[PDB]
Amino acid sequence: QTNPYKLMDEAAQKTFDRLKNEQPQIRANPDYLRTIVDQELLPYVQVKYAGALVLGQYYKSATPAQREAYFAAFREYLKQAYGQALAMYHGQTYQIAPEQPLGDKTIVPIRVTIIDPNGRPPVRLDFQWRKNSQTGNWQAYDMIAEGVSMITTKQNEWGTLLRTKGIDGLTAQLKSISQQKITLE
Amino acid sequence: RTEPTYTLYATFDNIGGLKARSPVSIGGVVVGRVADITLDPKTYLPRVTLEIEQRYNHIPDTSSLSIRTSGLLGEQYLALNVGFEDPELGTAILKDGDTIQDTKSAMVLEDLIGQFLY
Amino acid sequence: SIRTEPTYTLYATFDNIGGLKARSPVSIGGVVVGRVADITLDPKTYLPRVTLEIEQRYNHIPDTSSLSIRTSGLLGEQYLALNVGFEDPELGTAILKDGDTIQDTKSAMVLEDLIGQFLY
Amino acid sequence: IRTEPTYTLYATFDNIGGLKARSPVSIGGVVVGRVADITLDPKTYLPRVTLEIEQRYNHIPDTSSLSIRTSGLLGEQYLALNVGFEDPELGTAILKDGDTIQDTKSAMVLEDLIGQFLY
Amino acid sequence: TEPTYTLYATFDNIGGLKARSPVSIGGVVVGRVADITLDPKTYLPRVTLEIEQRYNHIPDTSSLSIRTSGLLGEQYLALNVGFEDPELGTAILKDGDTIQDTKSAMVLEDLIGQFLY
Amino acid sequence: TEPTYTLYATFDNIGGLKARSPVSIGGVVVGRVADITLDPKTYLPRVTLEIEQRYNHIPDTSSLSIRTSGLLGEQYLALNVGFEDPELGTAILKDGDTIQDTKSAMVLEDLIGQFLY
Amino acid sequence: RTEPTYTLYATFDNIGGLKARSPVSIGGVVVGRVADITLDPKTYLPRVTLEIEQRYNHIPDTSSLSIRTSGLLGEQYLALNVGFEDPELGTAILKDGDTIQDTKSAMVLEDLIGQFLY
């Protein structure tokens, strides 16, 4: 079973299923979004091949005592962003793209959408699923908003820190984002 | 001029206004120019063939290639981004005649100004 | 002429052609194929209609596709642009031969209206 | 000869902006005439305008509208017509020779909006 | 070519008004501006202009403002007629008179500085 | 011939003020600019002002600032008359004196920085 | 221009649309011209070499260097900024063959829209 379409289908269903079960408790306690994002999603996403890009050539210099700390703090950072992101829930659709034959490459872009009558015109969010060698099943490693990436803006922004400070600089400073929500829902 | 040239291929799906013989640059300095642009009769997807000099020739494949604009009323060009080398996961320095795997779409105006501020 | 170039014709209607002229480019994915030919009106309803041509090498387009006019850069030419649709084999689709009409269409952009609906 | 015989019409306004003579008139983006004269009423100081239409098109109900809008983003100005609908029994008056439109809209100026809002 | 008559006015910030620039009412051109000068007692700008004579029913309650045409085009001064009512003295205009109230120009920098507080 | 004289003042960031630029007051030109230079120590720019003689009698307290013209014009050093007061607002600007208060120019990235971040 | 001028080196990361023979300005007055720009084949980073007039020769070793646009639609030009000079403590002056360290970088019309609400 390597068809990504069926995986995305079941993923959307399970996500909105587990999401529908809570309405007042989540806004009474934000500690549930950071939980449910780990309850699912994360088995489908890859961390190594993602967190390797933001480093750059400096990867060839990282000591084995430093790599694991960054690799551990990266997930703890990644949770909060997607946690805060989930602040909408208007019962919106998700019309998947139609089927297509054998992929002619080990890299494939797939597109979804989202529509609701209560909001602005819709928007598309491409995804990328990578066809690895012998991993059998495949994972996703990126997201594209709309002509804008999410690994591009951060590949160079955390820049001069790499030149002057080092990996040690990015460590700890990554986790130092606290645990918060918004009071404007 | 010295011309020990390499050639490479890439595919897209929307290229804005990138006409022929435009420059290509890394980090802000020029290293080559596009050559031949065409369309594909099997599925209709634009395909570009570019060429590189021989002085710089140590790029690992895990790299990106995007399109952007210059100034406020200038001409578009192709920016590049270098990655990392690591065994098993991603090796194979580019040999002549290969294709760049990654790509990113073109930035369109009007669309976003209609989207936001609605 | 541009040396031979056998072609065929298509028709369409609209609602506000903006500032389009004659002999304007038609393109797909930023690559030009054919040019426009004639524009006129309807003395029974007053709705603008356009007749364009297309070079005859490309011979595979689904019946369900979109047409839309737009602008380039931020202050230049206005050009048409079409988008191929997805074909379903087992169902009923069709190709486009000489003397057909495209189903749907899009309008055009204009100032004043938006800048007065918002931030007024 | 520029064109065949035509026929004329009049209208009034409140502020015509920078509209000069020899300006086009169009529907749906296609031009169908020109502009004749612009003058002032020496009794109430209100600007009026007189224009003409070619003899080809000969069926427009009375209920219609006229407005002003800028060309492109940074260009000239051109009048813009807008047709009503066809409804017998109710609105019948065909545009004859030398009549006046009922409803009209005014022009737009820059620095006024800045004071109006976003100040 | 007409027999014209002249009027005076004072201001506060000329905003780059160049001599020989049209005077308009409701968007229609009428008179021309004659010249601008300074005062050696108050240091304030004064302007002398002239008008055609056929139009002659503009009362006292009226306004003069400065405004620019197009986006970044030229600039001029717009006259504004005021509503007239009975009882009160209408006071018709004659040669060699002055306007009372008015308005001043606009400067860019201050608007930006106000948008950021 | 302009029977003029000279004035001196300081700044810190002159933007893009080439020589031969007006010294307008209330949108009226009444002078010019001759020399700009830099002191070989503290590294702070200074200028040389020249104004004509009829407009004398200026209180020693005033203001002076830099401004741009329209949207994409040039730059013109502008003045702002202060105030005249008895006793503790005395005297005038004699030949070759120094101006007190200033107001630096304006740059782009400062704005974008105050915004966003 | 017979007067001797002494040269300095610097490194950046994303210079943008800079071009050779452009002015260096302090406070608003021009002083020196830019000489050469290139890359390094070991790590790929933009490197610049510039020349400075000999009269001005009393700089503290702490300073700032950054590029920024001109007017509103103008080109690019470097911008130097004098740092803090401390007595007693060691500071000294900038001699030949040295390099300035901490520098900023350019900005192109895409990362702005990007960072705008991500």
Residue numbers in the entry:
A (entry chain H): 24 to 208
B (entry chain E), G (entry chain F): 35 to 152
C (entry chain D): 33 to 152
D (entry chain C): 34 to 152
E (entry chain B), F (entry chain A): 36 to 152
Q: What's in the article?
A:
The Maintenance of Lipid Asymmetry (Mla) pathway is a multicomponent system found in all gram-negative bacteria that contributes to virulence, vesicle blebbing and preservation of the outer membrane barrier function. The pathway consists of an OM lipoprotein component (MlaA), found as part of a complex with either OmpC or OmpF7,8; a periplasmic GPL chaperone (MlaC) which shuttles GPL across the periplasm; and an IM ATP binding cassette (ABC) transporter complex (MlaFEDB). MlaFEDB consists of four proteins: MlaE an ABC permease protein; MlaD a membrane anchored MCE (mammalian cell entry) domain containing protein forming a homo-hexameric ring that faces the periplasm; MlaF, an ABC ATPase; and MlaB, a STAS (Sulfate Transporter and Anti-Sigma factor antagonist) domain protein proposed to have a regulatory function. Specifically, we report the structure of E. coli MlaC in complex with the MlaD hexamer, in two different stoichiometries (1:6 and 2:6, respectively), stabilised through the binding of cardiolipin.
Masked refinement and 3D classification, focusing on one MlaD hexamer, revealed two distinct species, one with a single MlaC bound to a MlaD32-183 hexamer, and another with two MlaC molecules bound, with final resolutions of 4.35 Å and 4.38 Å, respectively. In the MlaCD(1:6) structure, a single copy of MlaC is bound offset from the central cavity, on top of the main MlaD ring, predominantly interacting with a single MlaD32-183 monomer (henceforth termed MlaD1) but making additional interactions between both the clockwise (MlaD2) and counter-clockwise MlaD32-183 (MlaD6) subunits. MlaCD(1:6) has a Cɑ RMSD of between 0.7 and 0.8 Å in the core fold across all pairwise protomer alignments. Interestingly, the largest deviations occur distal from MlaC binding, for example between MlaD monomers 2, 3 and 4. Importantly, such a break in symmetry was not observed in the structures of MlaD within the MlaFEDB inner-membrane assembly, and is therefore possibly not representative of the physiological binding event. Whilst MlaC Pro124, does not make any observed close contacts in our structure, however, based on its position, the most likely location for interaction would be with the β6-β7 loop of MlaD2. However, many ABC transporters have been shown to have an asymmetric mechanism, suggesting the binding of a single MlaC monomer could also be feasible. The presence of two GPLs within the central binding pocket and a single MlaC bound can be reconciled by both GPLs binding to a single MlaC monomer.
